[PDB]
């Protein structure tokens, strides 16, 4: 039994991040023995947000149940050739190695093709500092693309990160620790 | 005549960024014909910065002096290997192609000297989506060093960063698409 | 049974990178069924290896050995904020998708702190480019403490590394092409 | 009277990138008081190039080139999502802080328009690394549309990033050390 968790950084409302977010969550939970959430970051209270004020509930509760995750998925629009301040915003409160002994599995759209490299130079690192111990490879989607009635190409390469992104996911609590640089001093 | 604006972008309250940015941005006020202000993310409304929504008028004001600008002085701690959500989540919302004909400095504060890439790779990059015109040497320093009260040797390359920016600065009307890859679209 | 092969790039002779990258090695091989080599990328014929022939022998073996690797250990020094030109000439000749299947260890060593993020920002999206499996943590040491004769702090980081690459490694055929945007067209 | 050196990358013989070069270089001369030199970094001797041997007369005479000029057009296929290894391995044997006082324009080609962020991710870093005056914007050019009978807005992207580059040409002493972290420390 594992738990997933999809975090979405998009700002805008209807977005093609969340639904790719969202059908990555439930290709997993069909696949595994798992259950989800999905963490839509524009729906968090934006002061508590921003100030990274765990008294705000429903924040704390974001905040646990990422650490409590065996498994995150990671997705962002391209914004300004990298990852939204959203997404980041969240990121950036999480504690210092949150992501120890979990898998990762980063998720983009964009406008143009141009974009694709956003994630391995831009997010792949800020993962990493978070003591992450998995990252599979990144996949993105040009956002007039997703409708999965998307072409046979990219319908395989998407759902082969997802399947890998599962396959990666680890029951052991040997590997709870795993990806952090001094796994004694926790996780 | 120029207009130089500093965007500080620590979440936390009498930050070092904010201090570096403010000794930055006096630095280059008496030593050149300039004006200036200080945009302190922090300050912003949350839910009108997440939002982008610019019928907030300190926000939309925030917007405005940033594109009027002849150059930007662009601080941040580095948090999780990057730059701040906060900071991101305000260049987030300028026009696509703010930063034309514009100079530009990138200033960081960080606990550890292992954070010093993080300017050139993560936020460098940022600024050249918006086609900026010059962006000069990153400068980044320890924050139990601010004090400038530092190491002369620390004290000489932020000097030097300052000096240049303010060296890069353009009067010239035939500057001001520079950076844009198709001027006559507008800026 | 897996195999091993660590790949160093420092164009000096008696470097340190290449006693990390050995240091690793070992280090792997005491700890689980494994045979290894270590290429050292200096010794490989210069026109050959510059020009991707692979009629030398030496060099297509040497290819022909990191495609057959469950595990490449990949050190460089920091020369000019990221790794050498020769390690990713090295690189350059691999197949399109040469890693996928495979686990992967970063190690670097460079004069200066500051070089740290190298790793993660500049060697880590070319091991991603090449379809690998799994990156686990960067390690980077400054050049003035390998002597292991290091600070115990530091050697339990790079310690934990090499474990966390140990336990990545894969028996199963299953996951051979794991990694790979397309499994069923190659690896 | 400028000083205009060219550099390309490419390994293969009959490069698109080593012509994007040339007529990057024609295009300076052409409007700018110039002389130019264009260093195929496959044409200097394989083994003198990776050991840094500046006994060789025709590698020491590029080294000084390199380090003379007022501009340098840098040029790259992609791969591997970054700089070739013969580029960086050119890079890498230039003194720490090579490109004090300099323009610099960089360029590229590539199969994929998913390439285009490898040189503000890739390239941009490394440049700033060895001190560099004045990076304008990256150009990218898809591989099959070079032939300039390209497309129109391809075409004016180009000519803008040449132009741009040209303009920032420096004529002054005074900006020959503007970059370097400590001026008076040479250059």
Same mark, same amino acid.
């Given at each position: 039994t594992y738990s997933i968790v999809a975090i979405s950084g998009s700002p805008?409302?209807?977005?093609t991040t969340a639904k790719l977010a969202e059908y990555a969550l439930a290709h997993v939970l069909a696949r595994s023995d798992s259950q989800g959430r999905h963490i839509?970051?524009?729906?968090?209270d934006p002061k508590a947000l921003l100030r990274g004020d765990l008294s705000n509930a429903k924040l704390k509760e974001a905040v646990d149940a990422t650490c409590n995750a065996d498994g995150l998925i990671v997705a962002t629009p391209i914004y300004k050739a990298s990852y939204t301040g959203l997404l980041k915003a969240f990121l950036d409160? $999480?504690?210092?190695?949150?992501?120890?002994?979990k898998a990762a599995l980063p998720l983009a759209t964009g406008?143009? &093709?141009?974009?694709? $490299?956003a994630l391995d130079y831009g997010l792949r690192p800020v993962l990493h500092?978070?003591?992450?111990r998995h990252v599979v490879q990144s996949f993105f989607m040009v956002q007039s693309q997703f409708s999965l009635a998307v072409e046979d190409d990219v319908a395989s390469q998407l759902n082969n990160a997802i399947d890998h992104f599962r396959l990666s996911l680890?029951?052991?609590?040997?590997? /709870?620790?795993?990806?952090? &640089? /001094? &796994?004694s001093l926790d996780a």
């Open positions: 805008s409302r209807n977005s839509h970051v524009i729906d968090l409160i $999480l504690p210092q190695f949150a992501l120890a002994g406008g143009s &093709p141009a974009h694709v $490299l500092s978070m003591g992450v680890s029951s052991e609590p040997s590997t /709870r620790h795993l990806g952090h &640089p /001094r &796994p």
